Structure formats: C-alpha cells, structure tokens
Amino acid sequence: SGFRKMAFPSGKVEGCMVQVTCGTTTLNGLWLDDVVYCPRHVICTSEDMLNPNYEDLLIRKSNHNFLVQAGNVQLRVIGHSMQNCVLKLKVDTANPKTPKYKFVRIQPGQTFSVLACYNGSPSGVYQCAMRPNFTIKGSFLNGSCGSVGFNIDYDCVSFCYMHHMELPTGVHAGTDLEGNFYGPFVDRQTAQAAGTDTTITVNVLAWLYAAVINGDRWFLNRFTTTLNDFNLVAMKYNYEPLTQDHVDILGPLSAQTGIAVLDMCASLKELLQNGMNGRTILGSALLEDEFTPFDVVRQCSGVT
C-alpha cells in the first residue's frame, strides 16, 4: 500500500536525449532512429523571440549550423526541415538506444512523465498532467526546452509533449512531437492568455478511490447524488463537468471498492462544500487531480 505521485522509469527516454546548438542557443533534442526532434526556437536569439519569422530565420541556416551532440560524440546532420513548431534534424546515424515508440497527442486531463533536461543531460523526472487550459505546471528553467513528456506501455514509449515555453504566469506550454502546440499558445515572447485552470474531476474521483483502497476512508459519507446535481456543484467550484464517459472509466475502481461512482461523487460534493476541516487524504491537504483512473489501477496493481 501507499500512494505516490509516481513517474515512469526514465531509462528509455534518457537514451534519446541529445544537445542541440544553433548559433548561441542550446536546447535539448530527441534522437529517435536517424532523426533529432527539437523546438524550432533553437534558431532564435533572445532578440528574435519577440517577433520571429521562423521561415525567414531558417533560410539563413544550413545542416552544418545545427550542432548535435549525443553524450560527448558529435552527430552529422544530413538534412533539416521544419514541421509546425519543431525542427527535424536528419542525422547519418540511427540512435542505437531507440526504444519502441509512438507520437501521441494527448487530451487535457491526461497525465505523463517529464524528463527535465539541460544541455542534453537529464536532471530529473516527475509526473504531471495536461491542464484543461492546455498548460502544464512543470519545473523548467532556461535551457530545459526540448525536454519531453511521455508514457510507457510495457516496452513502447508514447511521446506526447515537447517543452517550448514558460508563460509570464510561471506555467508551461509546449507541443506534441509533430510540433503542434497544446492550446492557443505560440512560440513567441508575447502576452499569452492562459484560460481558467479547472480541476480534472475524473482524476480527483480516481484519487479518492485510490485513498479508499489504501485505507483513508474518513471522507466516505451516507449520501448519493446524480450527475446533473453533482455538476451544479462542480461548476460552482471550477471543476470539469463529469460525463457518462468519466463514470464508465471509473467502473473498475467502483467495482474493486464497492463504492458506486455517484456515491463517490457525493463524497466529493461534501468535500467541496465543507473542505477537509484540517484533515488529509493520501498525505495531501487538497484534492489531487493528477492521477487518471488508469494511473490509479496501474499503481494499485503494480504494472511493470
């Protein structure tokens, strides 16, 4: 027992981190097969970021201007192209450490692990979620761009995020591995409106199921509710509306614990209306929303 904000083992992804330098800018790159993926803002200087014309800046760059270093050895760049907000640097050597992989565009509310990197070297790994407003609350300093978000299913790594930016609000924006930003963000140093950061209701309920499984049960009450009644409370508290799809995904957790999804919704409604009253659930004094129902089953069953 015990429940932790657990990340996927990062070994498969560490073997893909490289350093990419173009001019004076250095960021991280992702080497899979003979391609190195990195944010296109690697061609920008600090001045360019205010209003960059990426296509115009790219014309001035050739293959030899992209320095790609994997550990201490230099990779030969034989081609370059810009796909949306990422650069694909074709190299002459396939990464011998390339795991089985996929590129996936995740939905808001989905979780993933981030291997924070600087100069192509890993610093740490943590679990986070794509917020409903398409930002992530990461831990990224200057030089962390190109660090990737991923999930692992047995031996296949599903890369879902590449870090590009920090908004003036301290939150992070990035792209999928095809270079399309999550949300309305652009790779420009300009005022960018992050919308309301709502709580991921289905994840909070999944975490409440994880607490029941691990022994914390004080919040269980004698009440039930309906999806429409629950959603009136959820709206008031800036929670995402719970749908029948969410109830279905919570089916296996409802089955294991013997607590109906709507009964767990009524416990959540009471927790929203009354607060925790100085108590904790799974060592937290707030309702945690960064564990999906799949994460709870995975951690509670020990999937390797």
Added chain:
Amino acid sequence: SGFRKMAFPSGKVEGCMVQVTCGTTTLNGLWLDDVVYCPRHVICTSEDMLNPNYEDLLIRKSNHNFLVQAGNVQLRVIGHSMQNCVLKLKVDTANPKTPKYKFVRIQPGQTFSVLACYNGSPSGVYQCAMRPNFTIKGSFLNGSCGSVGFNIDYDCVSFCYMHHMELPTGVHAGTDLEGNFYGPFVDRQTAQAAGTDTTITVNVLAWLYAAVINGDRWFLNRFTTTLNDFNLVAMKYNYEPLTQDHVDILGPLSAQTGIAVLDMCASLKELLQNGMNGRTILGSALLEDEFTPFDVVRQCSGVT
C-alpha cells in the same frame, strides 16, 4: 520556474534490476559487478515470516536454489552469503550496465529516489524521504521487496535503501545496502512500533525558500525569532528541533533570497500557529518536508 517533487533519472538503476526467486518466493535483486543483492527474506515462505531463523533456513539452500534472471537471461550463481538482512549472490557475470556506485547509509531527513520494481521489472520512480522515525512513506505492493533507494551525483549512484517490509501501519521499513535496517525494525511479521513521525524542519524551511524563489511570497511576514524561541513552537508541533548546523546548511538559500534563516523561521512559526487559512504554497495546502536544502538548490539551478 515551477517546483516539483522530482526524482533522479532512473536509467542507471533500471540496468541493475534483476528478479530473484528462491523456492516459491520472488522478489527484486540489485546486480552490481558480479554480485546480486537482495533481502534475505527471499528464502522464507509466508509461514516462515512469523518467526524465521534465517541462518537455519539458509543452511537448507544452495547456489542452484537462487534463480536470478536479468531480463530474460539466467545468471549462474557461484556463491552466496548473508550479510546482516541482505543476501549477496555471487554470479559468474559482471553486470555490463553497472554504473559508478557507492553504498551509503543516509541520515533521517535525507531524501532519495525509489525505483519501484516487481519481478525485476521497473514500474515507476518517485522521490521520498527517510522519516525521523526511520520509515519511508512509499508505494510498495507485495513483490516490491528488493526495490532500491538511491541518489545520483553526476555519474555516481549512491544506493541508500533496499525495501524489505510494510508495517501494519502502511509505512515502509528497509535496510542500507549492507543489510542493516534503518531504525529498530526487524525482518519478521510481528508488531513493530514506529515512533512519532516528526516533521523535518530544515526541509520545510528549504521548501519555503524554494517558494520565495518561484514567486509564492504571501507567507513572508514582518517578524523574526531566535533558534530557542522557534524550537519551543517546533516542539509543540512535533517538528524536529532546528540546530546551528541546519541554519548553516540553509546559508546559500538565505543568501540567494536575501531572507535571513531566522526570519524564515518566524514565517514558519506563524504558519504553524495560524495555518494556511485556505491558501497554498507551491501547489500544496500543507508544509512540505521532503525537499532537503540540497534538493532545492539542485532543482532551482538545474544540476544534470
């Protein structure tokens, strides 16, 4: 910016995880050079755990009774010995993936990463701390024994923990890599008294410095205190007493922020006396004590 409960990249340790089976029991092993380290309770059946005589059970075991599998290949066991609560299984092949490493016995209040494993396969990685009562609040299911705790300094892995047990209280006890338990725990299925779980004061102050650095400043007040006055409050709230050694370790964080250690102590005293009043610090509604002053500097500076 942004502050996360970040773990060390787990790649170096994943390359050392093996599966160890003896009779009907299977747990994890740590293969470094030609030795596989694992908990000695691998020789026990569920019945043996109530009152095991390890030396007597070990006599009945020979090298061929320890099945060691690294991925899908079998390792030949050429020797075995019991050192405290761990077994050292000498194999005929040095682990080709052995990183630079050390075995260190950590102090309470020190943090480390855990690579939770089942059947020699990694499931996840999370950061945790050795509690002052010598327990860890992990996420370990049956079969996770032998999973290791470690820290990394550039390229050297310092293994500090090997998981052995879950107390009936849901907390975890284990050993250093020499097989000596942290705390008074024994590898027996018996009632084991975990003492008071105090809060690691120096880590809470380090985390308050991390919050100031990352922009959360509401808790900063107009007050100061003395070490003796602070410690009267710390005692009342089951916090570890702060010493001049702790003040010295917080020196660099005090220097960077310009907030004297005793001034931060007075902010902490007010937070203990008045609570958070429905507010958060670094996304937490409680005072976090699992970041050492070294962790805060490392994360805030991007050490790879």
